[PDB]
């Protein structure tokens, strides 16, 4: 009988872990895109200021 | 195949084993039980890779259930409309072909959530697209029904206006001269009434006109109610006397304009009513033929999304489930409900549909 | 309550029922009845609100 409860808890924990991993991967991709954008913006600003 | 009757879909974890009987193989156990139900079962692959959050999953499942109910109601309405024109065989389009094939052929390898429509978008996006398609199909069905209703009303009016028993008869069967075609002012005269069923009674009514204008006795001869129906002379210059030519004897006059333009317009209106009836019937038949595929596919996609959501809820993670066919003869409808519940030792089953 | 929870929240949600030693009076019921703890845990803000 406790086996069913353990399986249910495992499924819930796995769903939570999958959600967290997906959120972290999405945040990482967004951060990489924003890093590229910020590098481009900073390069443009530094070229404008220095030149 | 014997799948022409209702079909009951279901899904279960692919790692599960039969619970009603300790069968070695779940597919073999189902085939043995479906042998008891005289049914046939085959695997269906209709996946949806995108997976949302748990709260998102619950919200999506509830919305999918609501949308599936709405789409099924629309499909039933479309089937009823198709049966209304006596075009859908087996009552409400039970045997109506889908995808140029019967329902068992259409659902043999169903992939309603697959293909170009929502190939890999989010589940919420797929639900929104399905809802939009269902709404468009419902609007088309409503337009077809309204067109059929208008055409039927026009046909009824055309049929009713041609009686002439107590009203103006059909202009095609009517006589134009001296019947409001010209016959105006002092040039000529026009009259119409129903005094009893004899010429003397018509003469009795016409005597009350006081011979102000058009003193000629009224003549009434027609099949209208096997009684008086006249095209007589009563000049508009004596419109009061024209009315008195029928009012005194309770002739109940039914005079109306029947000029050449009026008669041509009446004939054109009758022809237009008939043509509109035929064209609306053809358009409704075509719309129902399209809808028996479109609305059915929308409802099937909503049901597939609901089944996928339930399977995800029935497993949690990792996403993995086995979906079974729905076909079952009508005799085993109740027994299959017991047998499936018997094998679902865990609706309590991972999935179920009608 | 547990059956309603497992139906509406068909997913996995743990429960922590704990019995109360003595009954507690109710306002509308005007009576003291044996009670139990309704501790429950689940993920998702919308799920928690539901």
From Swiss-Prot, chain C:
PTM summary: Glycosylated.
Highest taxon listed in the record's lineage: Eukaryota
Protein location: Vacuole membrane
Chain's role: Subunit of the V0 complex of vacuolar(H+)-ATPase (V-ATPase), a multisubunit enzyme composed of a peripheral complex (V1) that hydrolyzes ATP and a membrane integral complex (V0) that translocates protons. V-ATPase is responsible for acidifying and maintaining the pH of intracellular compartments. Is present only in vacuolar V-ATPase complexes; enzymes containing this subunit have a 4-fold higher ratio of proton transport to ATP hydrolysis than complexes containing the Golgi/endosomal isoform and undergo reversible dissociation of V1 and V0 in response to glucose depletion.
Note: Present with 55714 molecules/cell in log phase SD medium.
Subunit-level organization: V-ATPase is a heteromultimeric enzyme composed of a peripheral catalytic V1 complex (components A to H) attached to an integral membrane V0 proton pore complex (components: a, c, c', c'', d, e, f and VOA1).
Assigned protein family: Belongs to the V-ATPase 116 kDa subunit family.
Protein name: V-type proton ATPase subunit a, vacuolar isoform
Organism: Saccharomyces cerevisiae (strain ATCC 204508 / S288c) (Baker's yeast)
Gene encoding the protein: VPH1
Residues of the full protein shown: 199 to 248 of 840
